[PDB]
RNA sequence: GGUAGCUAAUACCGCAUAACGUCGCAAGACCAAAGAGGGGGACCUUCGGGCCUCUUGCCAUCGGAUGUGCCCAGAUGGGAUUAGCUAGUAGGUGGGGUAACGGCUCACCUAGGCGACGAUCCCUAGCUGGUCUGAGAGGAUGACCAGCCACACUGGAACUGAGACACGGUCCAGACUCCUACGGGAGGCAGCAGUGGGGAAUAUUGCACAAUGGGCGCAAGCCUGAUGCAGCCAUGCCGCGUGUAUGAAGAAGGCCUUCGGGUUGUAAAGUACUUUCAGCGGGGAGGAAGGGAGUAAAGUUAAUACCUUUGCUCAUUGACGUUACCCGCAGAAGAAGCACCGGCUAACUCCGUGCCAGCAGCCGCGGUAAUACGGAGGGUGCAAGCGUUAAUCGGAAUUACUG
């Protein structure tokens, strides 16, 4: 119980996939009020929960249209010090979601309750197995 | 004249006047090209010269020569003009830098391709 | 809060990474960091780059000196990010498992490995090769580097790449997917004010990027040159119209690869 | 930065021999030699006061080795030099290391008196010299490197050196090759069709 | 406070300092009073290396003026009088 | 600005203070004199004028009235003094 | 940050003490300051350290040197399609002021003061050393380097201090921008590197204080994008190399020919030969002087202590650095292009073409056999460059003082 090996071992760097348009973004979003990041929260395209609050989508394209690229991050929650990915839904786009999942060691996936398995969800698996 | 005289009022210098004023007198300019027509030039010559009307970067829109057998220019593009005049065809004070910017050197020159840009073809 | 209890109970402390020479366990010291991404970079600022790097292993510390595997050169960190949520952060010094941001000048690629002097590289990384169309003949009838500058500043990213003939003009870009429409909004956002628009190109490949021993390659440049290209980073490529004139092209033979390397 | 090309094409042009492909067989011809220094050597050259001035430094020059860019300068030398400079000019060619080699016989032409006095296999009163342009002083004396001491050519070349007009301002050797620079050239023990002024005037104008 | 010192007036990795009078604050190649000599660190084995005209170093630090120890290291390592 | 001497700042300002009234003792004191003198109590002009006499030179020897600044005062003031009275 | 309270010093402040000082003709007035270290025999006293002492430090008066004020004259752009300009304006007197003279300020008083040798007013502009050009007289210019000046977001102001009206200080106003829990806050790269922007176009978010020099410090030492190196770019000036020899009635190929041949052409081949410079390998100057540890010096002193000094002993100090340089290894291997050929201007033809296409610095080329167009052959001139455009002086005795 070293201050090196205990920092190691409080660590947990994760991902977030899915089919497009499913919840990372948002379900984002939220862990982060968890962690005490973001004091309050917002929706996507700063949509129907007003104020100018989105948010943390980083870029710009993504908040007119819906999510590009990953972004990154890091807050603590209970014990531990969670590293956050944010992976983009779109066959064509990405690539980088993938080089992403070679950053994390577990992985979490978003599911449309209203939709079931979407096409990228089983792709993505396929993708995950890879590393087990 | 006279000393005096010259004394007085002093023999006064008669400053230059740059054949081509397209400002700053500096190498070369950057310009919108606004229009790409053809004309005749002088009496003693007869052939259908091909020139743009460029609008240049520091404001002023100026007619420019087109050297070499054909291009690539026309609407807007993008060329950058130089120096030298067109004796024959008036008004025309400037040459387009060919295969610079949006243009493109002459096809298939071979001989003097410094100019008309374009490059050693399979040596 | 739940699937967070549940993240934090179950979910994996840093694991080992392999690499081409040993099991890398997390619980090691000596710095071992991996990249990964060159994200996007817009950015308030600065071309910035900022390489994504992963710390398999060893903590990070400011002034630390580290080793670039790939290129063989020993290189000191000083300027070395911690993102707070897609913003640069100020900079602190990191553990194992973290994600840590640096300065890309050329000198990162992606896969590209860091140690403290293992020369050794991760095996992981997929980095696969793009289709195409393209021709940005850009509005705003030019400049010219922004435009090309931010195109040659998108490309040191993992997503796209350009492509530039040897007629100076003809910019081609190829090609993620076929979203090659973020080129076009980061055309006018990041930092770069044009516009841009597309149109058909005869290109099916990609292309690939060439390179070997001498005078082979320089009767090799010359040949097929028609037909060749240079890219954004300074080297090489070909460019074909279909698959048969990309075998006999290769067929001329026998200098090397295939090469895409992002 | 050398010609490295047609020499004769050259020689045949000044209608002289410039000392270039020296070698075994001194005293030129053997190649056409006059009527036709191109496609249309046949041709009578009526020249103008130009090409009867611009010519005779176009010779000067390659009766050396040396180029424009830098010619010029020693002009530029002479003059500030007192004196004829015309003769200075030649003073100055003639000093040149690349030529004390060639004009000390330790090598065939004024050419292959080059490709050793670079890829150093000469010297001054120590130190080897490696620039083909060193400025020779009075006594400086050089010494073929005590190294690669006569080999399969350097030898082959005194042969016909010795028996060649033979200098006067140097007391060369030929076993123990080592010459000396006794005295900077005089006007009268040097020349033939060359002529000072006819080049010290085009750089004049 | 007029400090005796060196300048570096001599060229990529071949120096060629050079003792002069100046008031302290001045740039190191900044103004100053007059030359007294000069540093030679290269010269080879050979005829000079330095010269300094002693006998004007005295004058100033007559009227009080504190010396470089760089510029010590010379009034000495050349003796005084021998 | 974020630049440790900026207790130079801090450091000046009770300097100020504290010559700011020193300095404003000087006059005030100075002036005393001038009162005497726009009425005409040589007694009491000569009274003032020793009650400064040293003040003023003190606050020099400090460095707030520098040198000459001290004999200008009492130098045109003793000339005053008895040039009328 | 706010209020209360305690605490030290070379912080601050009296008193004392005073000349060679300030005020005053003189008599006499009145002015100052800090201590802190390394030691060390007496004696040792309220044995904290008093004291002896060297060592740095403080006060005061007069000086040295440097640095800065300030004043006068001459000179230092263009414009009269700028001819009149000015009231603190010009001088006086007298208070105040300044470090100092001074309209600096104020009061009073004379009424002046500058100007066609060009004031005033516009436009432009950092000045000199010098730089480029020229035979020179001159013309042009003032990047890099050094002297002087000025500014440091815009405008204004003072404070502190020897010195600032203060690039990385402060106060106010202005414009802009950034943080906030919304009440209030913060900042200015014309320091280095860097991004945006503009442009025909101008460099790496590098290394180290090792050397020279600066600030503090008794010293070691700390700080130092000053400096010294490095990274990028043929932008340039000076080098240098891409091979040196030898070689036939003179290859094939190309190109011209009245076909008899000429020419690229010794050019290539082939034959010998050298390997600088690169690439690979080794060995390795100089930029280092110094400081840091001990022994001695009529060195002073009460002292072999402590301090300095000078010899001497050992250990040791660089970023550049896989240095500069030197020796092999291999092998011509790995390294030539651009402009030009009617004339000025060195340098020729064929073909195509047809006043079309196009050339052009000026004259001037093209309407069928064009050395001036495009290509080819050939030739000419420059070479890591060559050309073009741009700009300056020259030629321009084409503002002519020389002329």
């Not at chain 2, 007869?46 to 240049?56: E, F, H, P, T």
């Not at chain 3, 990010?81 to 010094?93: C, K, P, Y």
């Not at chain 3, 075998?247 to 001329?252: H, I, T």
Request: hydrophobic share 35%; charged share 30%.
């Amino acid at each position: 119980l070293s201050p090196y090996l205990q920092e190691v071992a409080k660590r947990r760097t994760f991902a977030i996939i899915s089919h497009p348009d499913a919840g990372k973004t948002t379900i984002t979003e939220k862990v982060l009020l968890f962690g005490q990041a973001i004091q309050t929260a917002g929706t996507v395209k700063g949509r129907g929960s007003n104020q100018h609050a989105k948010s943390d989508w980083m870029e710009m394209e993504k908040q007119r249209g819906i999510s590009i690229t990953t972004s990154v991050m890091q807050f603590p929650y209970h014990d531990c010090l969670v590293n956050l990915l944010d992976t983009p839904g779109h066959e064509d786009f990405s690539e980088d979601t993938y080089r992403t999942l070679t950053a994390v060691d577990c992985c979490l996936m978003v599911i449309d309750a209203a939709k079931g398995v979407e096409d990228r969800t089983r792709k993505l698996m396929e993708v995950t197995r890879l590393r087990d | 004249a006279t000393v005096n005289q010259l004394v007085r009022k002093p023999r006064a210098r008669k400053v230059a006047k740059s054949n081509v004023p397209a400002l700053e007198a500096c190498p070369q300019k950057r310009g919108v090209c606004t229009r790409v027509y053809t004309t005749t030039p002088k009496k003693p010559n007869s052939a259908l010269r091909k020139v743009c009307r460029v609008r240049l970067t520091n404001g002023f829109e100026v007619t420019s020569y087109i050297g070499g057998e054909g291009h690539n220019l026309q609407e807007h593009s993008v060329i950058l003009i130089r120096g030298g005049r067109v004796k024959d065809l008036p008004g025309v004070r400037y040459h387009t830098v060919r295969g610079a910017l949006d243009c493109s050197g002459v096809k298939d020159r071979k001989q003097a391709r410094s100019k008309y840009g374009v490059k050693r073809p399979k040596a | 809060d739940h699937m967070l209890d549940g993240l934090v109970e179950w979910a994996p402390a840093p694991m080992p990474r392999q690499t081409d020479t040993r099991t890398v366990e997390a619980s090691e010291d000596k710095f071992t960091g991996f990249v990964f991404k060159i994200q996007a970079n817009m950015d308030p600022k600065h071309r910035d780059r900022v390489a994504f790097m992963r710390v398999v292993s060893g903590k990070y510390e400011k002034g630390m000196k580290l080793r670039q595997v790939r290129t063989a050169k020993d290189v000191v960190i000083s300027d070395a990010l911690t993102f707070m949520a897609g913003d640069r952060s100020h900079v602190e010094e990191a553990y194992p498992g973290d994600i840590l941001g640096l300065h890309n000048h050329g000198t990162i690629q992606i896969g590209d490995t860091f140690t403290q002097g293992e020369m050794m590289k991760f095996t992981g990384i997929p980095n696969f090769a793009p289709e195409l169309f393209r021709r940005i003949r850009l509005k705003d009838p030019l400049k010219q580097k922004q435009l090309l500058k931010g195109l040659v500043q998108l490309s040191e990213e993992g997503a796209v790449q350009v492509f530039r003939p040897i007629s100076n003009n003809d910019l081609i870009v190829g090609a993620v997917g076929v979203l090659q429409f973020d080129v076009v909004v980061a055309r006018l956002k990041s930092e770069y004010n044009v516009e841009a628009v597309y149109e058909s190109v005869n290109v099916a490949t990609a292309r690939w990027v060439e390179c070997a021993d001498a005078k082979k390659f320089e009767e090799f440049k010359r040949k097929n040159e028609s037909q060749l290209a240079l890219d954004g980073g300074d080297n090489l490529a070909y460019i074909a119209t279909s698959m048969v004139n990309l075998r006999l092209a290769q067929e001329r033979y026998p200098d090397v690869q295939f090469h895409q390397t992002r | 930065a050398r010609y490295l090309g047609p020499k004769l094409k050259l020689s045949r042009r000044e209608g002289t021999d410039l000392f270039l492909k020296s070698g075994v067989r001194a005293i030129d011809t053997k190649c056409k030699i006059e009527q036709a220094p191109g496609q249309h050597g046949a041709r009578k050259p009526r020249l103008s006061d130009y090409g009867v001035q611009l010519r005779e430094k176009q010779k000067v020059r390659r009766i050396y080795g040396v180029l424009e860019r830098q010619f010029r300068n020693y002009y530029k030398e002479a003059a500030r030099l007192k004196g004829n400079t015309g003769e200075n000019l030649l003073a100055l060619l003639e000093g040149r290391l690349d030529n004390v080699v060639y004009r000390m016989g330790f090598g065939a032409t004024r050419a292959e008196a080059r490709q050793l006095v670079s890829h150093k296999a000469i010297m001054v009163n120590g130190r080897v010299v490696n620039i083909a342009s060193y400025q020779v002083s009075p006594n400086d004396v050089v010494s073929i490197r005590e190294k690669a001491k006569k080999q399969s050519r350097v030898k082959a070349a005194l042969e016909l050196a010795e028996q060649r007009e033979k200098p006067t301002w140097l007391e060369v050797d030929a076993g123990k090759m080592e010459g000396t620079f006794k005295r900077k050239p005089e006007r009268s023990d040097l020349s033939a069709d060359i002529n000072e002024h006819l080049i010290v005037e085009l750089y004049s104008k | 406070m007029v400090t005796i010192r060196l300048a570096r007036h001599g060229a990529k990795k071949r120096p060629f300092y050079q003792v002069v009078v100046a008031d302290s604050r001045n740039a190191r190649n900044g103004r100053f009073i007059e030359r007294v000599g000069f540093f030679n660190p290269i010269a080879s084995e050979k005829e000079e290396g330095t010269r300094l005209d002693l006998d004007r170093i005295a004058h100033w630090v007559g009227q009080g003026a504190t010396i470089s120890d760089r510029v010590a290291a010379l009034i000495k390592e050349v003796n005084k009088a021998a | 600005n974020i630049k440790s001497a900026k207790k130079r700042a801090i450091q000046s300002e009770k300097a100020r203070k504290h010559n700011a009234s020193r300095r404003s003792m000087m006059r005030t004191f100075i002036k005393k004199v001038y009162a005497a003198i726009e009425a005409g109590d040589k007694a009491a002009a000569q009274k003032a004028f020793n009650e400064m006499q040293p003040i003023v030179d003190r606050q020099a020897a400090k460095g707030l009235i520098h040198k000459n600044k001290a004999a200008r005062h009492k130098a045109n003031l003793t000339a005053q003094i008895n040039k009328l009275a």
